């Protein structure tokens, strides 16, 4: 957890959100239910598919062969033959398996970013209209219907409208 | 008060990958770069068929052994196959000159 | 009568994956053989319900 969100202050992956990789769960008067985020998800699927396509499709393989038979009296060359194969099977094995872990931890310290990336947009959208619970959620200081909720997820959340009601309940607390 | 949350994926997967720091890191979905299987049967490499020798080897094939009257057949091939222990070769003992050096020559025609 | 881009002493290799571990003896445009027994890389998240 580099960015500190994945297995960080958000300790649980939501088994219920299957539309995407990132989303929100809202709880208000009208009800509850998960909802996944496409701006964050799709930027990640497309980039990762390409990151997979990257390492796959840069191994250019020429039409060649390996199997060579040597007479018993060219053993030094028959030994040389193997050295040329083992050296590649040395290299292409080492370099690959080290690249896997890398673009594994590089792929785990990407999703941790976007989760953290998402948080500091919703947190920088209300900014005092909700007090942060710390486990990866918010408690709105005001009644927020599904039309208000949907603006928080989109990105056009209205701060001035629900600001007057925020100070009257934040004063309560 | 109303609560909105931020959260990510989880599923029934039991795959585990290994990373630079920790191993057996269970992931929701993974992909494998390594090809581990074959089909047990030869195919048309390069598009054109290969030369199947069977009981005879490259020697008797070019020497036309009297028991290889079944495979003086093919007029285009991308590679040659033969059994690991060829049974019908140079029926008469003797030294075939530059033998190994010709299996790479007739390798593809 | 299959067609492939690779051929080993055990059988063909169909996918466009960049590595194989069937057999080092290949012929044609082939995923370069590697000693690995497993090369799984992450494409999702950590499974944390």
């Amino acid at each position, epitope marked *: 957890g580099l960015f500190g969100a994945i297995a960080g202050f958000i300790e649980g992956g939501w088994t219920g959100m299957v539309d995407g990789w990132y989303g929100y769960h809202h709880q208000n008067e009208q009800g509850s239910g998960y*909802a996944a985020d496409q701006k964050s998800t799709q930027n990640a699927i497309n980039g990762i598919t390409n990151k997979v396509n990257s390492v796959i499709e840069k191994m250019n393989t020429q039409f060649t062969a390996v199997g060579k038979e040597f007479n018993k009296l060219e053993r030094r060359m028959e030994n040389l033959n193997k050295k040329v194969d083992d050296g590649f099977i040395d290299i292409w094995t080492y370099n690959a398996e080290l690249l896997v872990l890398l673009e594994n931890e590089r792929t785990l310290d990407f999703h941790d970013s976007n989760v953290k990336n998402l948080y500091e947009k919703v947190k920088s959208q209300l900014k005092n209209n909700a007090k942060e619970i710390g486990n990866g959620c918010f408690e709105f200081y005001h009644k927020c219907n599904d039309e208000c909720m949907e603006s928080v997820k989109n990105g056009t959340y209205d701060y001035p409208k629900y600001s007057e009601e925020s100070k009257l309940n934040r004063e309560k607390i | 008060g109303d609560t909105i949350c931020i959260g990510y994926h989880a599923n029934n997967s039991t795959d585990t990958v290994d990373t630079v720091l920790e191993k057996n890191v269970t992931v929701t979905h993974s992909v494998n770069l390594l090809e581990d299987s074959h089909n047990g049967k030869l195919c048309r490499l390069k598009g054109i068929a290969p030369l199947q020798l069977g009981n005879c080897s490259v020697a008797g094939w070019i020497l036309g052994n009297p028991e290889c009257e079944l495979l003086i057949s093919r007029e285009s091939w991308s590679y040659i196959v033969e059994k690991p222990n060829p049974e019908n070769g140079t029926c008469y003992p003797g030294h075939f000159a530059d033998y190994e050096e010709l299996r790479e020559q007739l390798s593809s025609v | 009568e299959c067609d492939a881009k690779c051929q080993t002493p055990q059988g063909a290799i169909n996918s466009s994956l960049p590595f194989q571990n069937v057999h080092p003896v290949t012929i044609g445009e082939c995923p370069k053989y590697v000693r690995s027994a497993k090369l799984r890389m992450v494409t999702g998240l950590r499974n944390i319900p």
Partner: antibody, heavy 127, light 111 residues
Framework: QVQLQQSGPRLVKPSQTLSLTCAISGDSVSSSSAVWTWIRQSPSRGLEWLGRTYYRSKWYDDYAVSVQGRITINPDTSKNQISLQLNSVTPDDTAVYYC?????????????????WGQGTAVTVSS | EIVLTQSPGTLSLSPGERVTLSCRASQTVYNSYLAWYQQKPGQAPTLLIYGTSTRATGVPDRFSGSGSGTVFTLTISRLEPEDFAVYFCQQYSTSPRALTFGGGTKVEIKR
């Protein structure tokens, strides 16, 4: 393989309750790798999603905003079937009704497609 | 709500002619949640394409998807008699939940 068998051609009096049942064969209904989605189809309004159900250690229910408040999609772990409830049927609801599956794996993300279809149900609401 | 619109509505092409079916979206559908279907008259539709250009299992190679943003396109390289059918593209959103269709495109075989 996976086959979806549905109820026969039904007939419901106005303002009554529609009740269609979808049977799944070859796939556990509580499979964490499959989604159950209902979609109706009229010649006028075309294809329209109605609702979806699924099990991830617990069951969930999501229905399109066009039918919110009068629709439910209940599963049955015993008969290996699912159902559909459409209360207070108007002349608008006279159409066909299908049920879905989804093994559309995108690294765990679901496209929300239909890889398994059902033949259909003639649902006529009299007036 | 994302309502799709396909052009043309009804088309009459001879067999083997390259068939192009555009899918215009009222707003941007993301590269992952587009699915296509081929519905024969009377028969229920079947999966033709999902994702955006990912061939469904058991679908031949003449069909091939393409596009991004609010412009998607269905394409049959060689039209076939068994392609006398109406083709629907299908989108799915995640917030709010929306899964709609378009007007459909009937592929008439020109005689």
């Amino acid at each position: 393989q996976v086959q979806l068998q549905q109820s026969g051609p039904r007939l419901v009096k106005p303002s009554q309750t529609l009740s269609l049942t979808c049977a799944i064969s070859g796939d556990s209904v509580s499979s964490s790798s499959a989604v159950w989605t209902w979609i109706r189809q009229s010649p006028s309004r075309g294809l329209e999603w109605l609702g979806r159900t699924y099990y991830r250690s617990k069951w969930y229910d999501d229905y399109a905003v066009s039918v919110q408040g009068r629709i439910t999609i209940n599963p049955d772990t015993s008969k290996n079937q699912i159902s559909l409830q459409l209360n207070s049927v108007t002349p608008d609801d006279t159409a066909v009704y299908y049920c879905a599956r989804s093994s559309i794996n995108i690294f765990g993300v679901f496209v929300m497609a239909m890889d398994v279809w059902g033949q259909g149900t003639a649902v006529t609401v009299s007036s | 709500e994302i309502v799709l619109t396909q052009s043309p509505g009804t088309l009459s092409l001879s067999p083997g002619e390259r068939v192009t079916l555009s899918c215009r979206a009222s707003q941007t559908v993301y590269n992952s949640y587009l699915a296509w279907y081929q519905q024969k008259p009377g028969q229920a539709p079947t999966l033709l394409i999902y994702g955006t250009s990912t061939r469904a299992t058991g679908v031949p190679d003449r069909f091939s998807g393409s596009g991004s943003g609010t412009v998607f396109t269905l394409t049959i390289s060689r039209l076939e008699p068994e392609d006398f059918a109406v083709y629907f593209c299908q989108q799915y959103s995640t917030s709010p939940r929306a899964l709609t269709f378009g007007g459909g495109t009937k592929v008439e075989i020109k005689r």
